[PDB]
Amino acid sequence: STGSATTTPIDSLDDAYITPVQIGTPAQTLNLDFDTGSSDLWVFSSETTASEVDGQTIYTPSKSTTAKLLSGATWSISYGDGSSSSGDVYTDTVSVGGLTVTGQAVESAKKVSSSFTEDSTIDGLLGLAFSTLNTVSPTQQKTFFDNAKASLDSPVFTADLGYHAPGTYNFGFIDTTAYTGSITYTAVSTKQGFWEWTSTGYAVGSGTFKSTSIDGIADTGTTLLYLPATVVSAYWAQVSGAKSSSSVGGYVFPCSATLPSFTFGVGSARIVIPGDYIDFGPISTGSSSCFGGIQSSAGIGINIFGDVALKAAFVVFNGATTPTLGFASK
C-alpha cells in the first residue's frame, strides 16, 4: 500500500506546513502538522477546554463509529519552544492520502498551551520520530508510520517541502520524477528517538567548503536551521550589518541586504540552501530589521535541520531495520 498527501504552508513565511488527515468513521478531516521531531498524534477535540480553542477544527470521537476510549491512558508533552499539550487517548481509524491505519492511537487535547490556541490553522500534530518518544502512559503507543509500516510497499516516507508553495508527503514509495540526480543516503542514530545524522561540513555563499562533523536531527516540525555558534557566526559575518540581538532572540539583519546561500554536506554530496530561504522578513510590521533563518543551537543542546534546510531538498526517511536518511537536490 502507499499514500500521498499535499502539504501547504500555513502563512507567507513558511512557519509551518499542514496536511489534511482523515480521522474516524465517517471521516473527520483535520489539518495536522507532520512532525519528524516528535512521536505523538494529538488533535484538538470536543474535550478541549473551550477557552483554549480559537478557530481550530476539532475531532469529535462521539460522532465516530470506530472510536474507542483507551481506558486509563493519558499523555502529556512539552516541545522545544515551551509549548505543551496533554489529555486522554482514543483509538480510531486514521487515513493519510489514501493510506489507512486501523486502531491508531489518537491523543485528544484536554489542555493546550497559548501558542497552539493562537495558531488557528493547525488542528494538531502527527509525530513521525521513533515510537520510543511517545508520551502515552502507562502503555506507550506507536506512531502512524510504525503502525502503517507492515502494509507499505517500502518502509519509507519522503518529505518534499515547498518554498512558499505546497509540497508532498509520500508514504511507501520514492517518486523518481520529484528530484534531480542521485539520492545520497547517510546513517541514522536512533539512540535519542530522533532521525539523528551527521552532516559532513558547510560552506557560506561561494566560500570554500569546511569539512567538519555536525551531528543534528531532521525535524520537519521546526521552522529554522539551528547550528553551532561557530558556524552561525561565520555565516552572519558575511552579511553587512547583521548582528545577534538580545531583544529579538537571535540574529537579525538589515532588510535591504542580500543573503548568501548556505551549503551543508551529506556524505560526499552538497545541498545548497538559496539565500532567499534564509529571509524570514521584518521582525515587526514596518520594521527595516529582518529575522534570520539560521540561528545558534547553543541554548537548545541539539543541532536542528528544520524546514529551512529540508525544503531545499528531496528527503527520504528510510525506516528499514537499519534506518537511513536520503538527500537529493531538486
Q: Write out the residues near ligand U1E by the rule CB under 6 A.
A: 13, 15, 223, 248-249, 280-281, 283, 291
All residues at 6 or more sequence positions from 228 whose CB lies less than 8 Å from its CB, including other chains: 214, 296, 297, 298, 303
Q: What are phi and psi of 45, to 5 degrees?
A: -145, 175
Question: At its nearest, how many Å lie between ligand U1E and the CB of residue 295?
Answer: 8
Q: Strand pairing partners for 304?
A: 217, 226
Q: Which of 199, 219, 296, 297 is catalytic?
A: 199
Residue nearest ligand U1E by beta-carbon distance? 291
Q: Which letter does DSSP use for residue 52 in this model?
A: G
Residue among 200, 201, 160, 207 nearest 180 (CA): 160
35 is catalytic: yes
CA distance 167 to 6: 6
Is residue 251 within 8 A of residue 292, CB to CB? The reply is yes
Q: Which of 14, 35, 123, 219 is catalytic?
A: 35
Question: At its nearest, how many Å lie between ligand U1E and the CB of residue 81?
Answer: 8
CA distance 255 to 240: 11
All residues at 6 or more sequence positions from 61 whose CB lies less than 8 Å from its CB, including other chains: 24, 45, 46, 67, 69, 90, 92, 106, 108
Q: Strand pairing partners for 86?
A: 76, 111
Of the chain, the end-to-end C-alpha distance in Å amounts to: 26
Residue among 325, 83, 323, 298 nearest 191 (CA): 323
Is residue 106 within 8 A of residue 89, CB to CB? The reply is yes
Is residue 24 within 8 A of residue 92, CB to CB? The reply is yes
Question: At its nearest, how many Å lie between ligand U1E and the CB of residue 223?
Answer: 5
92 is catalytic: no
* Active-site annotation, residues: 35, 199
